[PDB]
Design an enzyme around this catalytic site. Structure first.
Site, PDB file in Angstrom:
ATOM      1  N   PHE A   1       0.851  -1.194   0.000  1.00 35.69           N
ATOM      2  CA  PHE A   1       0.000   0.000   0.000  1.00 35.69           C
ATOM      3  C   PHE A   1       0.888   1.246   0.000  1.00 35.69           C
ATOM      4  O   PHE A   1       0.677   2.185  -0.772  1.00 35.69           O
ATOM      5  CB  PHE A   1      -0.903  -0.012   1.251  1.00 35.69           C
ATOM      6  CG  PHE A   1      -1.664   1.285   1.493  1.00 35.69           C
ATOM      7  CD1 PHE A   1      -3.023   1.380   1.197  1.00 35.69           C
ATOM      8  CD2 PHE A   1      -1.022   2.391   2.051  1.00 35.69           C
ATOM      9  CE1 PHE A   1      -3.736   2.555   1.457  1.00 35.69           C
ATOM     10  CE2 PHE A   1      -1.717   3.575   2.316  1.00 35.69           C
ATOM     11  CZ  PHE A   1      -3.084   3.665   2.021  1.00 35.69           C
ATOM     12  N   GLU A   2       1.890   1.249   0.869  1.00 36.24           N
ATOM     13  CA  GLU A   2       2.789   2.389   0.978  1.00 36.24           C
ATOM     14  C   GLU A   2       3.603   2.592  -0.296  1.00 36.24           C
ATOM     15  O   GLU A   2       3.899   3.734  -0.682  1.00 36.24           O
ATOM     16  CB  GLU A   2       3.696   2.204   2.197  1.00 36.24           C
ATOM     17  CG  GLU A   2       2.899   2.053   3.479  1.00 36.24           C
ATOM     18  CD  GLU A   2       3.745   1.661   4.676  1.00 36.24           C
ATOM     19  OE1 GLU A   2       4.606   0.770   4.533  1.00 36.24           O
ATOM     20  OE2 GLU A   2       3.532   2.234   5.762  1.00 36.24           O
ATOM     21  N   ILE A   3       3.963   1.493  -0.953  1.00 36.59           N
ATOM     22  CA  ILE A   3       4.717   1.593  -2.193  1.00 36.59           C
ATOM     23  C   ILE A   3       3.846   2.292  -3.231  1.00 36.59           C
ATOM     24  O   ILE A   3       4.311   3.189  -3.934  1.00 36.59           O
ATOM     25  CB  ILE A   3       5.136   0.196  -2.727  1.00 36.59           C
ATOM     26  CG1 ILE A   3       6.187  -0.412  -1.795  1.00 36.59           C
ATOM     27  CG2 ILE A   3       5.682   0.305  -4.161  1.00 36.59           C
ATOM     28  CD1 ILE A   3       6.601  -1.800  -2.181  1.00 36.59           C
TER      29      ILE A   3
END
Lengths: 167, 167, 165, 153, 153, 165
Positions: free
Chosen positions: B100-102
């Site tokens: 998700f953060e990527i």
């Protein structure tokens, strides 16, 4: 705020290799097709890019950079065109491709509908904080799957994730 | 383009529950600490928010909405402040929080360094297209982990993912 | 307000083919290198090597090289706080223009340093660029202020004295 | 982790020269200057530049927001400043953290805040009670602190 | 899937009234109007509005880019238009797809393209060879088609 | 250029407390409802219910209600193509201002429809808002054009005739 015309543009995120997943998507499409608020539904696996210089392409195998760029772009283009995301999220086999798209969409401030599925409703109920907090609306896939045909995609009312342990 | 001062601000993404993962992060920090191009390294698990109204908080259990919002925000704040992302990515147990953060970072056009780890180097080598195409630089964690101490985080030279089957 | 450390992070955009271009960029560097409000300067031509590319500049390049190179540039733009473009008004570079639009979409300040070599022709400039850029420093007569400009705050300076089209 | 060097770049948002306000911004600047985590602080009124003036000044502010890593707003709760609110929304849309520092000369009055501000800001530091914290707050990471204790509308 | 209604909103980028260009944009408009996937097409030169004119016109274009779902650029390869390039970069930064439609009255000359444009655009439709495709292209999904066959610098 | 379908998607921002506010918004709706270039209109006050909230408007609200409500608004802003703000110049609403800044950061067009009820006072307006808004339609005398304005393209209209501060 009744829409004069349908304005919901769905980016339908979901794995699509083995059965069950392929079946979920199928029914998902059917439900969305029955929804009056939807103007368009995009599913990354429907079309597909063909790279003329790529011989004997195999899914899961090495792919040409041209195919990779075009396919990845088709997906980002789908997210760009969409107004909201709907993810058939397998809670049993976490899909990082879907999680990536959820984060990308939230970065663009777009609403994200999570539709979690689990074949072990009796096992622990836990979800990663980024997913739990990132999604704006949750619709249980196991027992509320059908409301995708009625949800007002013109405005996507929020519905915070609750009842899940968070880690 | 030698930097007059360090300008690399790292968002170090990684799971941190059981051992091995906790150990990876540890060494990661050490390597980054030795890197001349780094100005700051943020690791979501170092601090932690405490919600006074939350009694007997348990990790993985139900958490207050206030704790959830503040912790999730601490992470987005870390991503916002960062110039690039470094993800200790377990290829054996995909982490959707990291994925998700990527995606969130790539949506912000920020470079993302993927540092994949695998305990089964002899098993199939495959990666999801979104991750494979989303990341801008790949550094094998199993055999090139140490170059995190030398990588020029002031400019983050690209290094496309290759050698991985894609699905 | 008096930076407790240089915070300026410049993305230096410009063509790098002819001797003239290489020159402007060379001096640009030297100047910015004298500016105390700069913490870092990035120039796209300072390169990626595709191990599987049997390569010719200006020729057909591998997609891998294209992606890696294009990204290094977007990465420099992401990392940067502001853009400095050695904009050749005689030979419009669409790559630089693309980058100026990209940076403005990200709301970052853009400093246009134009050059003309042909004072005879009426000074004109496309609407986008005239309005897109936040600060203009003439390169033919003000090239020197790149060493003094405060990149910590990037004072605004609207474009004027150019026929708009 | 501990920053190898000051990383915080503050965009100090505050109304000006309307009595008291000038005083607030003044002390704030001093407090921030004492903060070891700050690399730079920008204040829209310090430096100064018709549709030409408007655009230039407006832009100088958007540029300050762009270079900034976080926003700190001396927010007067007695007289709502829409300029500061516009800026808070602008920074949140960019995913940047925002520190709200509310001030009120009337504690006897209702304690209420607009939802967009209460939910939009990521960290609240009361100006009347803990103004001094601006000197200790770690701007390299801007730890969150949700708004609480305010009726919301 | 098949759109329940036209979803595509085109931002047609092209230089104007400089001979030929006006003709290109003209045919393009006709071709797009024949496309069942388009809901709306915006052309910066059709409607029209000093620093006041500049800002208004500039803004009218950024607004067109904002409302747009994709960009279509009648790109003259013989005379590079930096206005169009600026717009292409602006749209890509917003993650919007961009259709490049290159034109050249000199095929005998080198076939080269700037890297930022070649990699920035998501779909290429040759103007001299397949201009008519603008009437069939599915703008509800804008399928990608990477630039190839151009020397890159 | 003649929309083959309405594409305008309005986020209607405005306070909704006093009878006056509720009125302007009511007429705003009726007007926009007559505009043929609108495909949808969203008004934040048309609400979320927190099952575990034993609730009082203006009182202490559950974090769940706050998050859900705040998001419905950001969602309306995300979905919208442009913003229409019934901006009370007598009682500045910081929520509306916040939203105007949010929308501009997203590069979306913003139509300011101001009201003053006090013509006696000099017409002033904060710099951000004066420069942030892309189109101004006076609500005290031009409220009617919201039914004619072409929201498919959103023609620009700079703010003028206001003391800037």
């Amino acid at each position: 705020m009744k829409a004069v015309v349908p304005t919901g543009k769905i980016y339908l995120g979901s794995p699509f290799y083995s059965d069950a997943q392929r079946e979920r998507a199928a029914k998902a499409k059917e439900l969305l097709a029955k929804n009056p608020s939807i103007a368009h539904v995009f599913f990354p696996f429907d079309d597909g890019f063909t790279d003329p210089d790529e011989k004997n392409p195999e899914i899961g195998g090495i792919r040409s950079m041209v195919w990779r760029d075009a396919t990845y772009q088709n997906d980002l283009t789908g997210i760009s065109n969409a107004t909201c995301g709907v993810f058939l999220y397998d809670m049993d086999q976490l899909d990082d491709g879907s999680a990536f798209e959820i984060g990308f969409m939230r970065a663009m401030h777009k609403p994200v509908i999570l539709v979690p599925f689990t074949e072990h409703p009796e096992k622990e109920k836990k979800m990663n904080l980024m997913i739990a907090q990132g999604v704006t609306t949750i619709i249980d896939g196991n027992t509320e799957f059908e409301k995708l045909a009625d949800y007002n995609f013109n405005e996507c009312p929020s519905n915070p994730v609750r009842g899940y342990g968070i880690y």
